[PDB]
Paper text:
The [name] polypeptide contains an extracellular C-terminal C-type carbohydrate-recognition domain (CRD)3 linked to a transmembrane domain and a short N-terminal cytoplasmic domain. Insight into the function of [name] is provided by the demonstration that, although the receptor lacks obvious signaling motifs in the cytoplasmic domain, at the cell surface it is associated with the common Fc receptor γ subunit (FcRγ), which contains an immunotyrosine activation motif that interacts with Syk kinase, initiating signaling that leads to secretion of a range of cytokines. Binding of [name] to a range of pathogens and their surface polysaccharides has been demonstrated. Microbial targets include Candida albicans and other fungi, bacteria such as Klebsiella pneumoniae and Mycobacterium tuberculosis, schistosome egg antigen, as well as dust mites.
The molecular replacement solution revealed that there was one monomer in the asymmetric unit, and difference Fourier maps showed two branches of the [name] carbohydrate cross-linking two protein molecules related by a 2-fold symmetry axis. Specifically, the density is strong for seven mannose residues and is fitted well by the Manα1–2Manα1–2Manα1–3(Manα1–2Manα1–3 Manα1–6)Man portion of the oligosaccharide, comprising branches D1 and D2. The carbohydrate was therefore modeled as two symmetry-related molecules each at 50% occupancy. In addition to this set of interactions, which are common to most C-type CRDs that bind mannose and related sugars, C4 and C6 of mannose in the primary binding site make van der Waals contacts with Trp-182. As a result of the orientation being fixed by the interactions with Trp-182 in [name], the mannose residue at the non-reducing terminus occupies a secondary bind site, making hydrogen bonds with Arg-198 as well as contacts with Trp-182 and Val-192. The overall fold of the [name] polypeptide is closely similar to that observed for other C-type CRDs, particularly those from mincle and BDCA-2. However, although several of the amino acid side chains that form ligands for this accessory Ca2+ are present in [name], in the crystals [name] has a Na+ at this site.
Residue numbers in the entry: 63 to 70, 75 to 209
Write the structure that this text describes.
């Protein structure tokens, strides 16, 4: 089942997915390692989330549980601080919302969004083989 909204054409998302902008989003409450999280999003036709604007992140974090961290579509494969987005958008020309003091270790090659007060939601690099929740993102279905 799809839930469709008018585009002023229709923008459709799977019924259990949250809608925003030109993308659909799914918040996976099952804890997996990063590579298994990406494969789970790929099995639904999506990828791990790629943050393109601040507004996209503000919508997403309203759906999250503050007591958990969520894997993002951002990784450092060679541990050389060369962060790459899962959909090959340029990391240098894109938004970056790292927490104060992050990233902070080349061995932490995967990016996660987490709630650290007083700052709140922000990115943190973590070990990829740690099991955490994740966020998937696919484009809207236009009919
Ligand atoms: O773990 C078992 C018990 O842990 C807790 O016990 C209490 C805990 O108190 C701490 C500290 O007082 C303090 O820590 C601040 C920082 O201090 C530094 O000296 C250093 O130790 C930091 O440790 C980081 O780096 C080491 C690398 O060796 C990691 O092993 C460690 O997990 C930590 O890395 C995390 O945090 C950094 C930010 O500093 C991130 O950049 C990393 O990516 C990583 O993030 C993960 O962890 C955080 C939180 O754990 C999580 O939110 C993320 O999502 C990632 O999963 C150290 O951080 O302050 C903190 C907070 O104010 C405080 O909790 O340890 C004391 C002994 O060390 C102990 O006496 C305390 O009781 C507590 O959870 C117990 O219930 C557990 O049994
Ligand atoms: Ca996006
Ligand atoms: Ca870190
Ligand atoms: Na890192």
């Amino acid at each position: 089942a799809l839930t469709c909204f008018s585009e002023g054409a229709w923008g459709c998302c799977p019924a259990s997915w949250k809608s925003f902008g030109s993308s659909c989003y799914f918040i996976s409450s099952e804890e997996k390692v990063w590579s298994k999280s990406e494969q789970n999003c790929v099995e639904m036709g999506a990828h791990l989330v790629v943050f393109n604007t601040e507004a996209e992140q503000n919508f997403i974090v309203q759906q999250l549980n503050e007591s958990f961290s969520y894997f993002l579509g951002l990784s450092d494969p060679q541990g050389n601080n060369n962060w790459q987005w899962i959909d090959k958008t340029p990391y240098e020309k894109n938004v970056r919302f790292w927490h104060l003091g992050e990233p902070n270790h080349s061995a932490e090659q995967c990016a996660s969004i987490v709630f650290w007060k007083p700052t709140g939601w922000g990115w943190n690099d973590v070990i990829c083989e740690t099991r955490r929740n994740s966020i998937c993102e696919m484009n809207k279905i236009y009919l």
